[PDB]
Amino acid sequence: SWGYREHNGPIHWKEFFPIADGDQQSPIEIKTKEVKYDSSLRPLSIKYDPSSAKIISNSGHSFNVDFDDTENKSVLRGGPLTGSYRLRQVHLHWGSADDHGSEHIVDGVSYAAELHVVHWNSDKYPSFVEAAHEPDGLAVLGVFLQIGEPNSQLQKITDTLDSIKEKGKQTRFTNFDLLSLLPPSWDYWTYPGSLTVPPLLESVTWIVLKQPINISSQQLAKFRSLLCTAEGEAAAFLVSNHRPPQPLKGRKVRASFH
Ligand SMILES: CCCCNC(=O)c1cc(S(N)(=O)=O)c(Cl)cc1Cl
Ligand SMILES: [Zn+2]
């Protein structure tokens, strides 16, 4: 099964998911001089209920905070989106080195990590699973993490990491004030892309925030102690879980600001 190790990593994903070589793949290089400001984009409008988070788990590929998506308690609206997109899950990507961990790269700068907030178009589709298969099904908000002061908003997450060391482990996790983790500016870049993990479906409106949040090196290192292996499988660590950048293939990256 897919992963980020030598034989199962990003270069080999095309073997089992041919869409890996598609024309709308993520993540990408954002070359700001080629970004087009678009005055018709709208501001992001976010409502995240801290009661929505229910469980944090080790998927074997990152941690995954799952949110109850029974109705519209937590939503993303506005930005490049038509209609309201419902919060599903949050996870994080990193690398083995603090200066090369993010999936999106900005003028060649890789950040230390990148947080993904995954939402689905409930205004048009009846479930996450159905939305994940449509070009306007999903919206992911991307937040960069840069090395700096320790971030107290990440303490809730890092305190659970020991309890979810092995793949498949999970721990109840609620009252997570995700709003308060975001940067204070919500200026963004946007482009049509894909899931950055298998099955790599081309169903994602990416909304990448310009402003990074901080994390300390010691906070970030905790994530690398997660395993990509389950209880009673020979241990291997998830030291890096970011996909390389993919060809832009004539897509337009637009900016909400100038
Ligand atoms: C345990 C299931 C496998 C893990 N899958 C993901 O974490 C995932 C990632 C993105 S990403 N990296 O594109 O934001 C999206 Cl859009 C949707 C999903 Cl479902
Ligand atoms: Zn992701």
The domains of the chain are located at 1-258
Residue type, 141: L
Query: What amino acid is encoded at 241 in this protein?
Result: N
**Reduced to 3 states, what is the DSSP secondary structure of residue 50?**
coil
Verify whether ligand 1 is closer than 6 Å to residue 203 (CB atom): no
- What are the distances in angstroms from CA 111 to CA 104, 105, 108, 139? 8, 7, 10, 21
For residues 180 and 249, the answer to whether their CB atoms sit within 8 Å is no
Q: Which two tokens stand for residue 109?
A: 């700068």
The alpha carbon of 166 is separated from its chain's Cα centroid by a whole number of angstroms, namely 21
Tokens of 178: 């995700």
Residue 60 · residue 229 · CB < 8 Å: yes
Q: Is 77 helix (H, G, I), strand (E, B) or coil?
A: strand
Tell me how far the alpha carbon of residue 208 lies from the centroid of ligand 1, in angstroms: 16
Task: Compute φ and ψ for 236, nearest 5 degrees.
Answer: -145, 140
Position 19: which residue type?
I
Of 93, 82, 199, nearest in space to 142 by CA: 93
Measure CA 240 to chain center. Answer: 14
Residue whose CA lies nearest to ligand 1 atom number 13? 195
Question: What ligand is nearest to the CA atom of residue 89?
Answer: 1
Is 1-258 assigned to CATH 3.40.50.9100?
no
Sign of the alpha-carbon torsion through 157, 162, 166, 172:
negative
Distance separating the N- and C-terminal Cα atoms of the chain:
43
Instruction: Give yes or no: 242 in active site.
Output: no
Residue 118 Cα to ligand 2 middle (Å): 8
Note the resolution in Å, 1 decimal: 1.7
Technique employed here was X-ray
Ligand 2 centre distance from Cα of residue 103 (Å): 8
